[PDB]
Amino acid sequence: EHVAFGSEDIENTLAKMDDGQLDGLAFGAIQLDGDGNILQYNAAEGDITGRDPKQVIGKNFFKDVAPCTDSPEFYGKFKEGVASGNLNTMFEYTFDYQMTPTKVKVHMKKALSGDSYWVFVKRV
Numbered sequence: 001e002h003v004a005f006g007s008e009d010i011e012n013t014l015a016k017m018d019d020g021q022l023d024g025l026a027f028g029a030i031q032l033d034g035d036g037n038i039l040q041y042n043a044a045e046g047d048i049t050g051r052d053p054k055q056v057i058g059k060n061f062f063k064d065v066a067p068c069t070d071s072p073e074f075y076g077k078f079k080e081g082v083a084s085g086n087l088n089t090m091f092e093y094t095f096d097y098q099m100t101p102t103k104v105k106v107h108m109k110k111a112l113s114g115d116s117y118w119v120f121v122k123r124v
């Protein structure tokens, strides 16, 4: 898929893309509901983190999968965005739960329709 990390209209491009198409992206992509449950999780993300995508779909990202993100610096930003109904933030972070610590750039953006939220990830 021909989409760049951080693209201004990424929510339109990805809107309603199915799991197979998401697996074509150059960067990790996770779709979360407003509670942080995982709705979609692509192959590039699994390559970065070791998680098996179909296994983490339905789990809570903050509670279960990624406790290192349960902090004001990641989850706090996410929940503020869910509560506001608007989110577009980009920041670096280190992923380190049961994995070699890995520095990444994270872009969280509210999905176009409904109430879903993207978490995009690339190595830095």
Ligand SMILES: *C(=O)/C=C/c1ccc(O)cc1
Binding pocket: 030, 045, 049, 051, 065, 066, 067, 068, 069, 094, 095, 096, 097
């Ligand atoms: C910290 O616990 C981060 C873990 C993590 C981040 C992103 C993922 O897709 C999976 C686990």
